[PDB]
Design a protein around this nucleic acid. Structure first.
Ligand SMILES: [Mg+2]
Ligand SMILES: [Mg+2]
Ligand SMILES: [Mg+2]
Ligand SMILES: [Mg+2]
Ligand SMILES: [Mg+2]
Ligand SMILES: [Mg+2]
Ligand SMILES: [Mg+2]
Ligand SMILES: [Mg+2]
Ligand SMILES: [Mg+2]
Ligand SMILES: [Mg+2]
Ligand SMILES: [Mg+2]
Ligand SMILES: [Mg+2]
Ligand SMILES: [Mg+2]
Ligand SMILES: [Mg+2]
Ligand SMILES: [Mg+2]
Ligand SMILES: [Mg+2]
Ligand SMILES: [Mg+2]
Ligand SMILES: [Mg+2]
Ligand SMILES: [Mg+2]
Ligand SMILES: [Mg+2]
Ligand SMILES: [Mg+2]
Ligand SMILES: [Mg+2]
Ligand SMILES: [Mg+2]
Ligand SMILES: [Mg+2]
Ligand SMILES: [Mg+2]
Ligand SMILES: [Mg+2]
Ligand SMILES: [Mg+2]
Ligand SMILES: [Mg+2]
Ligand SMILES: [Mg+2]
Ligand SMILES: [Mg+2]
Ligand SMILES: [Mg+2]
Ligand SMILES: [Mg+2]
Ligand SMILES: [Mg+2]
Ligand SMILES: [Mg+2]
Ligand SMILES: [Mg+2]
Ligand SMILES: [Mg+2]
Ligand SMILES: [Mg+2]
Ligand SMILES: [Mg+2]
Ligand SMILES: [Mg+2]
Ligand SMILES: [Mg+2]
Ligand SMILES: [Mg+2]
Ligand SMILES: [Mg+2]
Ligand SMILES: [Mg+2]
Ligand SMILES: [Mg+2]
Ligand SMILES: [Mg+2]
Ligand SMILES: [Mg+2]
Ligand SMILES: [Mg+2]
Ligand SMILES: [Mg+2]
Ligand SMILES: [Mg+2]
Ligand SMILES: [Mg+2]
Ligand SMILES: [Mg+2]
Ligand SMILES: [Mg+2]
Ligand SMILES: [Mg+2]
Ligand SMILES: [Mg+2]
Ligand SMILES: [Mg+2]
Ligand SMILES: [Mg+2]
Ligand SMILES: [Mg+2]
Ligand SMILES: [Mg+2]
Ligand SMILES: [Mg+2]
Ligand SMILES: [Mg+2]
Ligand SMILES: [Mg+2]
Ligand SMILES: [Mg+2]
Ligand SMILES: [Mg+2]
Ligand SMILES: [Mg+2]
Ligand SMILES: [Mg+2]
Ligand SMILES: [Mg+2]
Ligand SMILES: [Mg+2]
Ligand SMILES: [Mg+2]
Ligand SMILES: [Mg+2]
Ligand SMILES: [Mg+2]
Ligand SMILES: [Mg+2]
Ligand SMILES: [Mg+2]
Ligand SMILES: [Mg+2]
Ligand SMILES: [Mg+2]
Ligand SMILES: [Mg+2]
Ligand SMILES: [Mg+2]
Ligand SMILES: [Mg+2]
Ligand SMILES: [Mg+2]
Ligand SMILES: [Mg+2]
Ligand SMILES: [Mg+2]
Ligand SMILES: [Mg+2]
Ligand SMILES: [Mg+2]
Ligand SMILES: [Mg+2]
Ligand SMILES: [Mg+2]
Ligand SMILES: [Mg+2]
Ligand SMILES: [Mg+2]
Ligand SMILES: [Mg+2]
Ligand SMILES: [Mg+2]
Ligand SMILES: [Mg+2]
Ligand SMILES: [Mg+2]
Ligand SMILES: [Mg+2]
Lengths: 144, 93, 190
RNA sequence: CGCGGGGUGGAGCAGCCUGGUAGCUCGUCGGGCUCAUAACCCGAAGGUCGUCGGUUCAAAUCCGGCCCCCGCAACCA
RNA sequence: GAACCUGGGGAACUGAAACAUCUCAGUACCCAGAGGAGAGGAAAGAGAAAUCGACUCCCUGAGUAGCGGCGAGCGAAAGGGG
RNA sequence: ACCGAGUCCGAACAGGGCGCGUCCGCGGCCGUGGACCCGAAACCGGGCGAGCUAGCC
RNA sequence: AUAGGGAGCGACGCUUGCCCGGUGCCGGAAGGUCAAGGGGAGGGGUGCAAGCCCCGAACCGAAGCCCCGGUGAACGGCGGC
RNA sequence: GCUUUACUGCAGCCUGGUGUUGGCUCUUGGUCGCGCCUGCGUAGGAUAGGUGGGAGCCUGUGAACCCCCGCCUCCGGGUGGGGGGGAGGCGCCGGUGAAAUACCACCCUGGCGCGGCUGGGGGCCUAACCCUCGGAUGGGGGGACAGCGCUUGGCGGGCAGUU
RNA sequence: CAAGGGUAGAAGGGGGCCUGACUGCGAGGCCUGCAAGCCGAGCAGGGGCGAAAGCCGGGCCUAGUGAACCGGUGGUCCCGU
């Protein structure tokens, strides 16, 4: 009894799987509760449509969210907000870094995603990270 | 009675009683010690299903049981809405 | 797999001890199935083949030049039944079971290599080879080997034991051919 | 007529479930001995195991021909 | 709606010189439907031919082939001519 | 099977068993049809009856 | 369930004995026998073959019957010389 | 027409197998891929099952005294888990026996733990089916039973046809 | 072995070799509604006893039995959709 699952359940593989059962089990429990569906070619095929249109439509976050490292990885920042002897001008913060994360050129930008633990408020050569796929740590130069 | 999905209905068969040992073995052969007329009914079973607004019930051979379920998917391509257990049925094929 | 690789039988100091086992019909009817000892074999072992084939007393001269190191005659007759279990012979040919102390009191008793003169001829091929056994009240076949001195010579048991059987009446089926012992195990398709 | 379960002391009759063991009451004989009789008590004759045959140091046992009584689906022009 | 047609159901007397298989008989009859007809119909056919070529109806084949308490009795098809 | 004025049984150049019209009419008789005519007691099918009678509401 | 069905007897009085061998009915989770089905040792038919087809032992397989026991206001029976 | 332990059926009732027929379980079967078991009359360190080969497996893959302590019975150990740990034991050869102990192949008479193919016997659940509840796409109860389909065998003058 | 007919010039009693209690046929008859039942010379094959002539296709004779159909075995030149 070919059946395609949904909310995965023990003894039966994870969601969207072509697992076999007992006719009764399916007709009187699964299907009724919407915990599965019949492996009718009509769906069994419309499933691959969930696949290719998700597996072959993944070269975007996996193969293009990456280009957020092909251009804004190897390009200096340098804080145009000088400083004292060591405590930086502009406090150098997630914002005073995200303002021109895209300004410098023109392809992508972001504000929150930053391995910025605590506001720098101190001169130096910092280089933290971003997210979520391969983490891209950008070179920030807290100049004086 | 008669299957709503496959039209199967009871047929007349003949209850044939035989005596004696076959020819396939010992010998002489089998003798009909009687032949009564009789009917064989199809394994009718009751099948209730949700489908659309109301939950309708089909009466069908155990053989053609799935055919009713695959008959509900296809139903999903129809404009039911109207609350009538009857009509929905006719509305199936 | 239409064949069985003749190489893989590699616990010894010189592997040539590989055996040939089988399993057909166990105690069929009220008889069975026994295999002749020194038949011939496509080769001929390599151990001390003391074919003490106790034939005519005239088997001490030329009967010790192409058969065995020591071949009994008529001086090793009842002088082997009264001098301990030291003084294994076979037997004689023709209709005269002369079992005085070599084929009655207990090892071999097949026959003598039809020569009626000695044992050095060259019209045979079973002087220095491997013997055999018989059933076992459960198992069967039994044997030794052929010889280790060639390439595809490991297929000498697939023609002298795995392709040479004609001593069984009616049982069921001879399915086994699982050979090779005292080292490896070749229970392939033989 | 086909599968397949056993014959044992005169009789009742266990081992064969994994091969050396000749089991016992009653009954037969003497005794012990009691009121007669009876349980009981001790000794004891009382089984080439149907047998042509394979198997073993030893075979009733591993087991073949069926010889016979019980069981015996069913069949029966 | 007289018969005719198709489908769904479907006897017994009788015959077998008793009777049960068998026969009568898918007859009588009940029911539904069709129509001036009805049914069938363009091969998942026939059957031995280097074959034929929808279906139906008639003549033959044929009381043959066979079926059968191998009893009583039942009884085709191909092919050929229309 | 097949053979053929022969063939079968048989081993048998023994024997013995079997080996020469159609069509129409007419008449007698036979088979299947009720089959010379009338006659049951009964069997089955589909209906019609509880305005008589029986029970009950 | 002081109700409903079946059976025999038939106000009331005094009572209603003995026999479970057979028959019936009730109780027996053991044994024996037992169908389809399961199972397949082994065997057969063809094919060059893979194979495709058949028969088919042992063993597992219910009710029922055999067996054990009960039961008479159950069917019945209730001595001879 | 009636009867019955006359024949043959049929209704009806009983019954196995499958179908409707599902979850989770604990317990055992048939047995084919497995892992290791066992036979203790004599020889005997011991309990050698067999046919035969038959003189090295073993060693930092740790070969010997040592301890927790599982198993089975013929109470001998067959056998085996942790650490100290060591550098050699088994056996051919021998006693002996109808066969001989290092070793490996392949057989099982009984047996057996990790698992498939799979059948039984219990439980529990609920969601099929069934019954119920001032209407319920819901709640109670029963529950994979019962019912109903196909099929097995049986009882079967209740009825039928007949002799 | 019932009775009868027959029979010692054996069909009776005893012994020695044997298996004709043959196969393939069968002139001609008895009896007779049918089909059954009965007798049988002789020819061929291959034998048995006898020196041989010859006798032997069960038994002194008359009962000791059962059409067909349906099946079971063993074979064989046959048919084999
Ligand atoms: Mg299923
Ligand atoms: Mg019958
Ligand atoms: Mg009829
Ligand atoms: Mg009839
Ligand atoms: Mg189906
Ligand atoms: Mg009709
Ligand atoms: Mg009739
Ligand atoms: Mg009549
Ligand atoms: Mg008549
Ligand atoms: Mg009559
Ligand atoms: Mg009739
Ligand atoms: Mg008819
Ligand atoms: Mg008819
Ligand atoms: Mg009809
Ligand atoms: Mg009709
Ligand atoms: Mg009409
Ligand atoms: Mg009309
Ligand atoms: Mg028309
Ligand atoms: Mg049409
Ligand atoms: Mg077409
Ligand atoms: Mg065409
Ligand atoms: Mg078409
Ligand atoms: Mg044809
Ligand atoms: Mg008949
Ligand atoms: Mg007819
Ligand atoms: Mg024609
Ligand atoms: Mg034509
Ligand atoms: Mg002639
Ligand atoms: Mg006439
Ligand atoms: Mg007339
Ligand atoms: Mg007439
Ligand atoms: Mg009259
Ligand atoms: Mg009348
Ligand atoms: Mg009537
Ligand atoms: Mg009527
Ligand atoms: Mg009326
Ligand atoms: Mg009235
Ligand atoms: Mg009235
Ligand atoms: Mg009462
Ligand atoms: Mg009452
Ligand atoms: Mg009452
Ligand atoms: Mg009365
Ligand atoms: Mg009265
Ligand atoms: Mg009193
Ligand atoms: Mg009384
Ligand atoms: Mg009384
Ligand atoms: Mg008394
Ligand atoms: Mg008394
Ligand atoms: Mg009684
Ligand atoms: Mg009783
Ligand atoms: Mg009783
Ligand atoms: Mg009884
Ligand atoms: Mg009972
Ligand atoms: Mg039982
Ligand atoms: Mg069976
Ligand atoms: Mg079967
Ligand atoms: Mg099967
Ligand atoms: Mg097989
Ligand atoms: Mg039972
Ligand atoms: Mg009985
Ligand atoms: Mg008891
Ligand atoms: Mg009891
Ligand atoms: Mg009793
Ligand atoms: Mg009585
Ligand atoms: Mg009358
Ligand atoms: Mg009913
Ligand atoms: Mg049932
Ligand atoms: Mg059932
Ligand atoms: Mg429950
Ligand atoms: Mg519930
Ligand atoms: Mg409800
Ligand atoms: Mg509910
Ligand atoms: Mg419950
Ligand atoms: Mg059920
Ligand atoms: Mg039945
Ligand atoms: Mg029945
Ligand atoms: Mg009956
Ligand atoms: Mg009657
Ligand atoms: Mg009657
Ligand atoms: Mg009649
Ligand atoms: Mg009669
Ligand atoms: Mg006289
Ligand atoms: Mg004489
Ligand atoms: Mg005549
Ligand atoms: Mg003559
Ligand atoms: Mg002659
Ligand atoms: Mg006589
Ligand atoms: Mg006589
Ligand atoms: Mg005489
Ligand atoms: Mg007849
Ligand atoms: Mg032919």
């Amino acid at each position: 009894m070919k059946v395609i699952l949904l909310e995965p359940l023990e003894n039966l593989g994870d969601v969207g799987q072509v697992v076999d059962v007992k006719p009764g089990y399916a007709r009187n429990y699964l299907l009724p509760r919407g915990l599965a569906v019949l492996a009718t070619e009509s769906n069994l095929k419309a499933l691959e449509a969930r696949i290719r249109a998700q597996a072959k439509r993944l070269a975007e976050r996996k193969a293009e969210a990456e280009r957020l490292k092909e251009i804004l990885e190897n390009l200096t920042l340098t804080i145009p907000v000088r400083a004292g002897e060591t405590k930086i001008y502009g406090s150098v913060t997630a914002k005073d870094i995200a303002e021109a994360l895209s300004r410098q050129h023109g392809v992508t930008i972001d504000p929150k995603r930053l391995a910025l633990e605590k506001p720098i408020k101190e001169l130096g050569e910092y280089v933290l990270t971003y997210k979520p796929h391969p983490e891209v740590p950008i070179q920030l130069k807290v100049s004086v | 009675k008669v299957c709503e999905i496959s039209g199967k209905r009871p047929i007349v068969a003949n209850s044939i009683q035989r005596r004696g040992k076959a020819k396939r073995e010992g010998g002489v052969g089998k003798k009909t010690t009687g032949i009564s007329k009789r009917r064989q009914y199809p394994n009718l079973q009751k099948v209730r299903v949700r489908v659309a607004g109301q939950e309708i019930t089909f009466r069908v051979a155990a053989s053609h049981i799935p055919k009713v379920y695959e008959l509900v998917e296809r139903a999903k391509g129809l404009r039911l809405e109207g609350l009538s257990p009857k009509e929905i049925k006719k509305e199936l094929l | 797999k239409v064949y069985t690789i003749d190489e893989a039988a590699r616990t010894a100091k010189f592997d040539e001890t590989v055996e040939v086992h089988a399993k057909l019909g166990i105690d069929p009817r009220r008889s069975d199935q026994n295999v002749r000892g020194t038949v011939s074999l496509p080769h001929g072992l390599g151990k001390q083949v003391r074919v003490l084939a106790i034939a005519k007393g005239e088997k001490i001269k030329e009967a010790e030049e192409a058969g065995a190191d020591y071949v009994g005659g008529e001086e090793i007759i009842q002088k082997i039944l009264d001098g301990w279990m030291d003084f294994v012979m076979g037997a004689v040919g023709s209709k005269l079971g002369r079992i005085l102390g070599p084929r009655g009191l207990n090892p071999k008793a097949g026959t003598v290599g039809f020569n009626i003169g000695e044992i050095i001829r060259e019209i045979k091929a079973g002087r220095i080879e491997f013997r055999n056994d018989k059933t076992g009240a459960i198992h069967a076949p039994v044997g030794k080997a052929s010889f280790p001195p060639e390439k595809l010579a490991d297929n000498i048991r697939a023609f002298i034991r795995a392709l040479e059987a004609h001593k069984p009446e009616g049982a069921k089926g001879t399915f086994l051919r699982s050979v090779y012992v005292t080292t490896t195990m070749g229970p392939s398709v033989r």
